Amino acid sequence: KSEQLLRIDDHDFSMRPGFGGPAIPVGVDVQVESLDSISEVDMDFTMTLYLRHYWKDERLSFPSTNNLSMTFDGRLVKKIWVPDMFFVHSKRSFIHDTTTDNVMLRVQPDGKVLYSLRVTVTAMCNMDFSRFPLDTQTCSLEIESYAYTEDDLMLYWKKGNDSLKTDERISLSQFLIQEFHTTTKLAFYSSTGWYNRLYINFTLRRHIFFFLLQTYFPATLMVMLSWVSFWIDRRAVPARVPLGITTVLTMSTIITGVNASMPRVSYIKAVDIYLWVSFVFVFLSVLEYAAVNYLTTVQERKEQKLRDTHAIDKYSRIIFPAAYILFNLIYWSIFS
Amino acid sequence: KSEQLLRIDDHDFSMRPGFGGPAIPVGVDVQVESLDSISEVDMDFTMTLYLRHYWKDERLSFPSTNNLSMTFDGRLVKKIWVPDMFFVHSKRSFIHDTTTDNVMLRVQPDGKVLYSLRVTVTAMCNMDFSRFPLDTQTCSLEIESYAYTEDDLMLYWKKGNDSLKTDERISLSQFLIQEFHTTTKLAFYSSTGWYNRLYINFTLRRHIFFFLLQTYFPATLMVMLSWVSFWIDRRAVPARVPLGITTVLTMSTIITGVNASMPRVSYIKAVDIYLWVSFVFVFLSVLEYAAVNYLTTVQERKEQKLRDTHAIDKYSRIIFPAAYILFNLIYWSIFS
Amino acid sequence: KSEQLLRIDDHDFSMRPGFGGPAIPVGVDVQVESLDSISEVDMDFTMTLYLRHYWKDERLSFPSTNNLSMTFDGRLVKKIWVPDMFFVHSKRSFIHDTTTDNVMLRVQPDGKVLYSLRVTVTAMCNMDFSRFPLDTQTCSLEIESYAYTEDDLMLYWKKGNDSLKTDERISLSQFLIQEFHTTTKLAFYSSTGWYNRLYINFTLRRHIFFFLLQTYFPATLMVMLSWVSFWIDRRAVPARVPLGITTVLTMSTIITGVNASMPRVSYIKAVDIYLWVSFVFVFLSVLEYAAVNYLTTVQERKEQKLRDTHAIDKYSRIIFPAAYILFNLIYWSIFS
Amino acid sequence: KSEQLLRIDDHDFSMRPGFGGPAIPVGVDVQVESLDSISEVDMDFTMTLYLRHYWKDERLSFPSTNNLSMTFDGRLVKKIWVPDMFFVHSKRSFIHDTTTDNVMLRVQPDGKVLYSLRVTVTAMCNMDFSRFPLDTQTCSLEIESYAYTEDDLMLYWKKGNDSLKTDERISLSQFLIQEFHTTTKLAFYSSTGWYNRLYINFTLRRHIFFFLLQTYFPATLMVMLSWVSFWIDRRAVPARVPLGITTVLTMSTIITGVNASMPRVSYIKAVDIYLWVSFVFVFLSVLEYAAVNYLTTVQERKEQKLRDTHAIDKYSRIIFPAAYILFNLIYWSIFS
Amino acid sequence: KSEQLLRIDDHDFSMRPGFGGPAIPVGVDVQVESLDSISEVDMDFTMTLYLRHYWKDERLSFPSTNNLSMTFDGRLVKKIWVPDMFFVHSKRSFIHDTTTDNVMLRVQPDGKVLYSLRVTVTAMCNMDFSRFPLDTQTCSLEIESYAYTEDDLMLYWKKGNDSLKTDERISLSQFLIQEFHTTTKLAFYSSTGWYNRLYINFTLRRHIFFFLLQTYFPATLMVMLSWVSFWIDRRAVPARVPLGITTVLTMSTIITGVNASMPRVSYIKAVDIYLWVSFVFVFLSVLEYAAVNYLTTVQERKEQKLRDTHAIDKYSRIIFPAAYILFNLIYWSIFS
Ligand SMILES: C=C(C)[C@@H]1[C@H]2OC(=O)[C@@H]1[C@]1(O)C[C@H]3O[C@]34C(=O)O[C@H]2[C@]14C
Ligand SMILES: *[C@@H]1O[C@H](CO)[C@@H](O)[C@H](O)[C@H]1NC(C)=O
Ligand SMILES: *[C@@H]1O[C@H](CO)[C@@H](O)[C@H](O)[C@H]1NC(C)=O
Ligand SMILES: *[C@@H]1O[C@H](CO)[C@@H](O)[C@H](O)[C@H]1NC(C)=O
Ligand SMILES: *[C@@H]1O[C@H](CO)[C@@H](O)[C@H](O)[C@H]1NC(C)=O
Ligand SMILES: *[C@@H]1O[C@H](CO)[C@@H](O)[C@H](O)[C@H]1NC(C)=O
Ligand SMILES: *[C@@H]1O[C@H](CO)[C@@H](O)[C@H](O)[C@H]1NC(C)=O
Ligand SMILES: *[C@@H]1O[C@H](CO)[C@@H](O)[C@H](O)[C@H]1NC(C)=O
Ligand SMILES: *[C@@H]1O[C@H](CO)[C@@H](O)[C@H](O)[C@H]1NC(C)=O
Ligand SMILES: *[C@@H]1O[C@H](CO)[C@@H](O)[C@H](O)[C@H]1NC(C)=O
Ligand SMILES: CCCCCCCCCCCC
Numbered sequence A, B, C, D, E: 001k002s003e004q005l006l007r008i009d010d011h012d013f014s015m016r017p018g019f020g021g022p023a024i025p026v027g028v029d030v031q032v033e034s035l036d037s038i039s040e041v042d043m044d045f046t047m048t049l050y051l052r053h054y055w056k057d058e059r060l061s062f063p064s065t066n067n068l069s070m071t072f073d074g075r076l077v078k079k080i081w082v083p084d085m086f087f088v089h090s091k092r093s094f095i096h097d098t099t100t101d102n103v104m105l106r107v108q109p110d111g112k113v114l115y116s117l118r119v120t121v122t123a124m125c126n127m128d129f130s131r132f133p134l135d136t137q138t139c140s141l142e143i144e145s146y147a148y149t150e151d152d153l154m155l156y157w158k159k160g161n162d163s164l165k166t167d168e169r170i171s172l173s174q175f176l177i178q179e180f181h182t183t184t185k186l187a188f189y190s191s192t193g194w195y196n197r198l199y200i201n202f203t204l205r206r207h208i209f210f211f212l213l214q215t216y217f218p219a220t221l222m223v224m225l226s227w228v229s230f231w232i233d234r235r236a237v238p239a240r241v242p243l244g245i246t247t248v249l250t251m252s253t254i255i256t257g258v259n260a261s262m263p264r265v266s267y268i269k270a271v272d273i274y275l276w277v278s279f280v281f282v283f284l285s286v287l288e289y290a291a292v293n294y295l296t297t298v299q300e301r302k303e304q305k306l307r308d309t310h311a312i313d314k315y316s317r318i319i320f321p322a323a324y325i326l327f328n329l330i331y332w333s334i335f336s
C-alpha cells in the first residue's frame, strides 16, 4: 500500500509543519479559465480558475530507489495538513466534482508538495454609474488564510508577476477587459492579528459608439427637426400646431424606450441629463408659436377696430441653434 | 496527538457546562461584510457576516509550560459542546465551505473558547409603500438560541454597542443605508418559556431627485402645455381639436411607461394620485373647447335665421392655473 | 453518559410503541411564521412554520431523584422511533440547518416526548381567474402519515382549534389574508387503507380600488370623449375625422398596456369583456360620421344638378349614452 | 431485532433473485399527483408522482405464527436487492425527504415485496408551433431499467391499463389536459442489448376564443376601418391623408404589442401570416388615394391651361372587401 | 460473496494498472441524448449524454466455469481504480441519481471493464454577433484527464469517427443544428506536461425568412411610404406636413419595438445599420418639403411687392429611389 510508505499513523497532522518555530512559507499560482457573467444591479461577477499551492513538509518524505513522485486524489486530503485559503468578500463558491472531485496531490521524495483544485467563485464589486455610458470600473479578487496569522503562515506569489496566467479567449458580451495584474497588502483583525492578502485586478470598459448611435442620435435629430417650424408661414395654423405637438410625442416615446432598456439603477446618470434638456428645447419651441399667434391676432383686431416675418421668428432662427451648440460644448467638456 | 491533551473521552459532551446550576453566559460579536440584495416584491434582504461566540468551560483546560493557545478546525465541533444559535424570521441560510469549512475554534490554557464562522442569511422585512417614492423603511436581523431558555443560557452583547462593526464600503444600488445599532429584548413561548433575543437595526431611503425628474416633471409640463389652447383663436377648429386629443394621448403613454418601470405592488401609492389627477386636468381642457364651439355655432345660426374672445376662455385662463396651484399646495403639505 | 440512562441497546427501535396492540395517538401543533411568496402562473404558495409532536413511549422512561427533563439535539433522532409525517400535494421542502439542524427532542421522566422542527414548504393551490380582479381564492396545507394507517397510528389536533397560531405581522404584498381555521378528514388508498389528514385553511382577496382606478377609469373617460364629436359642426371634416381616429389609437394603446401588466393567464376574464366592449363603442362612433358625410355630399350634388343638424347626430346624442348605461347596469349586476 | 428475522448476513444481496435462471418479473403502478409547470421555450414539463414496484424474493421469507407483514423505512434499502429504474430523456429529478425520506418497504411472510417512493421529474417534449394558436401537442414519460436486459429482468404494467391513476383536480394555467393511457415497447442498445420500456401519454390543447379576441378581432376591425376613406369626398385632402397614415400607425402598434406577449419562438407561425397580410391591405389603401389625388390635379391644371366620384374609388369600394373575403376563405380552409 | 472472487484486499487500487511501465490505453464512446438550452447573453449551452470507458485490468480477473460477466453498481467504484475524466471549460455539471446513481460497471472474466454513467454539463462557447441575423456559430465539448499525463494514460476514440451517436430527435427552438464530428489534439501545461484532448463539434444557424419578415419588411415599406408626398400638390400644407411627421413617429416606434425583442448585446450588429439608415431617409424627406414651402413663399412675396411642379420635387422623385436601391445593392453585397 502506498499509504504505508508515508507514516500516516506515526505523525499528528492536526498541527502545521514546523509548529512551535518560524512560520512556514506557502506559494500560490493562479490560472484564470473564464469570466462567466456580470450583474450590474447586484454588483458582482463570476469566475472559474485553477488554484495551486506549494510548500514543504518533512514528515511526508519517503525512501525511493529513483526520483519518481507519487500522485493522489482528494481522498488523501482529509488525512494530512493542507493550507486553508478562502476568498474574501465573496458571495458563493463551489468545487467541481464530475466525474470525480477535481483535486490533486503530488509528493516528491524529499517532501515537497503540490496541491491543485478547480473552483468557481462569485465576488462583490462596488460600481459607480454617474458617468454612464462613459464609465470605467475596476475589480479585484482577494485570497487570504482563514485561521493563521503571519506569525504562523507566510503567503506570497510564487513567481511575482509571472504567477498570473489568463486564457487567450476570455471575453464578455457587453464589456472589454484589460490590464490584469497582481498586488499584495497586509490586513488587521482586532480578534487575532495581521494577515497577508493577495489581489487580482482588472478593468472594464463599454462600446461607446453603440450607445451614441442608439441614444444621442435620435434626440439630436428630433431637436433639429423641431427648428423647421420657424421657416413655415405663420398663417398656416393647422400646419404649425400639429408639427410641434407630434414632435413632443415622438421625443417622449423615445425617452421611455431608452429608459426601458438600461440597467435599473435609480439615480441620475450622464445620459439622463442630455435627454431631459433636449425635451425642454422641444417644449420651448411650441410656446414660441403660441406667442406669435396671439400677438398677430391682437394686431389684426386692433387694426380692424380702427377702420412678412414676425420678429420673434427671425430671432428664434438664430437663438435656438446657438443655445444648443453652447450646451453641447459645455456638456462634452465636462463629460469628456 | 493534540486531542489527547483535552480529555475528550473522559467527559460527556451532550450536556452544557455548569449543568444543574446557574446559567452559563455567552457573549456575541458581529461584523457585517456586505449587503447582497433586497427584494421589494417578496420583502426580504440578504446579508453576509462573521459571527463570534465567547464562553468558558473548565472541562477543556490543559497543562501548558507557556501561554500559547491551540487552534482547531470544524472537525472538532462534533466532539464537544457548542452554542446552538439560529436566525429568527429567516428564509434560507448557509455556511461557506470553500476551500474548506469556514469554521474556527481557539482554546486558551485556562479553558476559554472562541468560536467563529462565516454565514450568508436571507431574512424577511415587512415594508409599506403608501408614500412611494418618499417612503422610509426600517429593517432588523434577530438572533436567538433554539433549545436553551434564559434559565440555562444567558445571551448578551460582549462589549455593548461596540460589538457591531460594519464594512467601510457597504452600499446598495437603489437605496441609502444608515444608522446601525444593537438592542435586546425578551421573548416568551408558551411551550417552553422565556428567551433572550438580540437585534441589529438599520434604515433605508431613496434618491428623491431621480424620481422627481422621471415622474413629476413630464406630467407638469404636459398639464401646462394643455393650457396653450386658451390663447388660440376659437375659429381655428382644425388646430384646436388635434392639440387636445394629442396631449391626452401623450399623457396616457407617459402613465403607461411609468407604471411598467415601478415594482409591481398592487395598491394605491402617492405617485399614482398625482398622475391621475393630472390626467383629469388635461381631460377637462377638451370639454371646455367643446362648449365654446357649440355656443358659437348656436349664436351664428340664430343671427342668420333672424336676418372678440368668448367669456369661457377669459375665465379659464385664470381658473385652471389657480386650481392646479391649489392642488399642488395641498398635496405637498400632506405628503411633505 | 446520558444515552446510558436510556437503554438504547436493550430495546428494538424499528417498531412503534405498543406494536401488536391498539394504535398509538399522536398530537400536533403548528405555529405559522411567515408567508414567503405566491405564484399565480404556477399556482402555488410558500410558507415557513414550526411543527410539534406529542406522544408517550415507556421505553424511554428513566429513573431520577427529581422531576427534571433532558434535552437532545437532532443526533439522537436516528437511534429512536419518531413519527414520519409528510406534506400532501407539495412540490418542494427542506429543514433549516444554520448554524446546526433546527431539531429538538425533550424527554420527560415518565416517558413523554416532544419533537420540534422548523421547516419551509411550497405547496400547490388551484386557482380560478374567471372573475379577475373580483375573484376570491381558498387554499389549504395538508399533513398525513406516510407509512402507518389508522389501525397503527391515530393523528389528531392536540387542542382542537387552539392548536393553530399565526404571527401578528403576517402579510402578502398583493393580497389580503383572512380566516385561518383547521379541519380533519379521512382518506382512502386502495393499496394500503385509511389515513387521517389534517388541514389548515385560509382565504385571499385583492385591493379592488387600485384595479378600478388603473383599468376601468381610463376606458370610461375615452368612451365619453368619443361622444364629443356629436356636438361639433359637420362641415368641419378635418376636425371630426382625426378626433375619431386618434381616440381609437389611444384606446388601443391603453388595452395593450393593461394586457402587458397582468398575470399571463390565457383565457377570458371579467376585465377583458369590459375593455373590448368599450373598444367597439369607440369604433361605431367613427362609422357614424362616415354615414353623415356621405349623405350630405349626395344631397348637395343632387340639388346642384337639379338647379342645421343632421337627424343621425340628434338621435346618436341620446342613443349612445343610454346604451352604455344599460350595458354597465347588466355587467355590474352579473359581476357584482 | 426485526432485521435478524431476515437472515441478512446469510445471503449475498449484490445479485438478483433467481440469478443464473429465468428473468424475474417486476410489476409497476403509477399515480400522478400534479403537473407542476411547462416551458415552451425549453420544451419540457415537470411532474410529481408515486412509483410502486412488486416482486417476489424467497430469501426475505420469515417464519410467522400469523399472517402479518413487516414495514421498513429507507434505511433497509441499502441492505437488500431492489430494482434500478430510471426515467428516460429526463433533465433533472429528486426524491422528497421531509420530514424524512419518502420511501417504504412492506414485506409479506412468504417473501412478496412492495417498494414505494415519491418523486419529482422534469422531462423533455418536442413541440411544433407552425399552427399556433391552433396546434396540438403530445407528451410522454418513459420508464426503463438501467442495468438489466430482458434476459435478467422482465418489466411490465401490473394491471394492464388499470395501473395508471390521475388526480381528480389536475389542471394547467394555459393548457387543457386529456387522454391519459399507457403503452410498452422494446428498445435496442448495441453495447448491451434489448430493454423493455413503459410509456405514459397525454395531449395538450389551447383556449381558442381568447386568442381570437386578443389577436384576430382588432386586425380585422382596423382593415375594415381603412375602407371608410373610399366614401369620403376626394377634395378633402387634410381629411383623407391623416386617416390612412394613422390607421397604419395603429396597425403597427398592434403588431408590436402582440409579438411582445407570445413565447419567443423564432420561425413563422400561423398568426404571423394573418397579421402581415392585413398590414399590406392597409398599406395599399393609402397608395390608392395618392393615385386619385395625382390624376385629379393633372386634369384641373390641363383644363385651366386650355382656357363626381372617380372611377378608381368606385371600383375600390367593390374590389377590396371581395379580396379580403377570398383571402379569409383560403386561410381558414388551409388552417381549419 | 461476489466481491471475494475479486481479490480486493490483495491489491493496491490507489495505483494505475501497469504502474512503472508503459501507459495504459483507454477507449471512449459518447451518445448525445438532448440539447437542453442555450444562452446568448451568457454564451453557453447545456447537454445530456452517456459516457462510456473501456480498458483492461489483470487484477480483476476471476476464474469461471463459463463465459458470463458480472455487473455492479456505483458502490464498487470506490474500491477499485477508474479513470478520472473531466470536461474542459465547463461551468457546472452533475450525475443523475434517481432512483439510484446512474452508474454501471461490467467486468469480463479475463479482466476487461466497461464503465458507464449519465451526466448533464454546461459549457462555454464564444459567440460573435456582428453579422446578426446572418451569423453562424461553431461550438465544441472537450474531454481530458485531470491527473495523468500522456506518459501514464493514453486516451483515444474507440472506433474513430463511429464513436459518436446522436439522437434522431435532437432539436432547438430557435436554432438549426448540423455537422457533428470528432477530433483530437495534444495540449501542454507548463506545470505538469502533455495531455490528450478529445473534441465534439457542431454548428448553429437561424431561420432567415422570419427575421426578414419581422424587421426588414416594415422599414422598407415605411421608406417607400415617405416618397408619396413628392406627388402631392405643394399648396396643401396641412396634408404634406402631417404625413412626414407621422411617418417619422411610426418608424421610431418600429425601431424601439425591434430593439426590445433582440438579445441584449451591446455592440453594433448588421440589422442596426439597415434600420438607422432607413431612419435617415425618412428624416431627409421632411426637410425636402421645408425647402419647397420656403422658396415658394419667398417668390410670391417678391411678385406681390412688385405689383406647376417645383423643380426640387421633380428631381426628388428620381433621386430618392435610386439612392435607396444603390444602398441596398451595396449592403447586400457586403453581408451576402
Ligand atoms: C396621430 C397623431 C400623431 C396626431 C393626429 O392629430 C395630430 O395632430 C397628429 C397628426 O400626426 C398630425 C395631424 O395630421 C393629424 C391629424 O389630423 O390627426 C393625427 C395626425 C396624423
Ligand atoms: C535522481 O535519482 C537518482 C537515482 O536514480 C539519484 O541518484 C539522484 O540524486 C536524483 N537526482 C535528483 C536531482 O534528485
Ligand atoms: C506587476 O505588474 C504590474 C504592471 O502594471 C505592476 O503595477 C505591479 O507593481 C507588478 N507587481 C510586482 C510584484 O512586480
Ligand atoms: C504567561 O505564561 C507563563 C508561562 O511561561 C505563566 O507562568 C504566566 O502566568 C502567564 N501569564 C499570564 C498573565 O497568564
Ligand atoms: C447603542 O447605541 C444606539 C444608538 O442610537 C442606541 O439606540 C442603543 O440604545 C444603544 N444600546 C445600548 C445598549 O447602549
Ligand atoms: C416532583 O418531584 C418530586 C421529587 O423532588 C417527586 O417526589 C414528585 O412526585 C414530583 N411531582 C410531580 C407532580 O412531578
Ligand atoms: C374550529 O373553528 C373553525 C372556525 O370557523 C371552524 O371552521 C372549525 O370547524 C372548528 N373545528 C373544531 C374541531 O371545532
Ligand atoms: C392465515 O393465517 C393462518 C394462521 O393465523 C394460517 O393458518 C393460514 O394458512 C393463513 N392463510 C393465508 C392465506 O395466508
Ligand atoms: C466460452 O466459454 C467456454 C466455457 O463453457 C470456454 O471454454 C470458452 O473458452 C469460451 N470462449 C471464448 C472465446 O472465450
Ligand atoms: C470524422 O468525420 C469527420 C466528418 O467530416 C471528419 O472531418 C474527420 O476527419 C473524421 N475523423 C477521422 C479521425 O477520420
Ligand atoms: C450626435 C450626438 C453626439 C455628438 C458628440 C459626438 C460624440 C463625442 C464623444 C466622444 C467620446 C470619446
Ligand SMILES: CCCCCCCCCCCC
Binding pocket: A268, A273, A276, A277, A280, B209
Ligand atoms: C443632483 C446631482 C447633479 C445632477 C444634476 C441634475 C440636473 C437635472 C437638470 C435637468 C434639466 C431639465
Ligand SMILES: CCCCCCCCCCCC
Binding pocket: B208, B212, B216, B217, B220, B332, B336
Ligand atoms: C416638479 C413638481 C414638484 C414641485 C415641488 C417640488 C417638491 C417639493 C418637495 C420636495 C421634497 C424634498
Ligand SMILES: CCCCCCCCCCCC
Binding pocket: B268, B273, B276, B277, B280, C209
Ligand atoms: C384607497 C386609499 C385612499 C387613496 C385615495 C385615492 C384617491 C385618488 C383619486 C384620483 C382622482 C383622479
Ligand SMILES: CCCCCCCCCCCC
Binding pocket: C208, C216, C217, C220, C332, C336
Ligand atoms: C368607473 C367604472 C365603474 C363604475 C361602477 C362603480 C363600481 C361598482 C362596483 C364596485 C365593486 C366593489
Ligand SMILES: CCCCCCCCCCCC
Binding pocket: C268, C273, C276, C277, C280, D209
Ligand atoms: C369564453 C367564455 C365566455 C366569455 C364570453 C366573452 C364574450 C366577449 C365578447 C366581446 C365582444 C366585443
Ligand SMILES: CCCCCCCCCCCC
Binding pocket: A209, E268, E273, E276, E277, E280
Ligand atoms: C464602428 C464599427 C463599424 C460600424 C459603423 C456603423 C455605421 C452606421 C451608420 C448609420 C448611419 C445613420
Ligand SMILES: CCCCCCCCCC
Binding pocket: A287, A290, A291, A294, B224, B227, B228, B231
Ligand atoms: C406656462 C404658461 C403657459 C401658458 C401661456 C400661453 C402662451 C402665452 C401667450 C401670451
Ligand SMILES: CCCCCCCCCC
Binding pocket: A317, A318, A321, A322
Ligand atoms: C437666418 C440666418 C441663418 C440662420 C442659421 C444660423 C445658424 C446659427 C449657427 C451659429
Ligand SMILES: CCCCCCCCCC
Binding pocket: B290, B291, B294, C224, C225, C227, C228, C231
Ligand atoms: C360627459 C359629457 C360627454 C359629452 C360632451 C358633450 C359636450 C357638450 C357640449 C354642449
Ligand SMILES: CCCCCCCCCC
Binding pocket: B317, B318, B321, B322
Ligand atoms: C391675462 C391675465 C394673466 C393670465 C394668467 C393669470 C395667472 C393667475 C394665477 C393665479
Ligand SMILES: CCCCCCCCCC
Binding pocket: C287, C290, C291, C294, D224, D225, D227, D228, D231
Ligand atoms: C363595414 C363597412 C365599412 C365601410 C363602410 C363605409 C361607411 C359607409 C356609410 C354609407
Ligand SMILES: CCCCCCCCCC
Binding pocket: D317, D318, D321, D322
Ligand atoms: C357600392 C356598392 C356597395 C359596396 C359594398 C359591397 C360589399 C362587397 C362585398 C362582396
Ligand SMILES: CCCCCCCCCC
Binding pocket: A224, A225, A227, A228, A231, E287, E290, E291, E294
Ligand atoms: C431653407 C430651408 C430651411 C429648412 C429648415 C432647416 C432647419 C434644420 C437645419 C439643420
Ligand SMILES: CCCCCCCCCC
Binding pocket: E317, E318, E321, E322
Ligand atoms: C416620374 C418619373 C419616373 C419616376 C420613377 C423613378 C424610379 C427610379 C428607379 C430607378
Ligand SMILES: CCCCCC
Binding pocket: A284, A287, A288, A291, A312
Ligand atoms: C420662449 C419663447 C417665447 C418668447 C416670448 C416673447
Ligand SMILES: CCCCCC
Binding pocket: A311, A312, A315, A316, A319
Ligand atoms: C422681441 C424679440 C424676442 C426674441 C425672443 C427669442
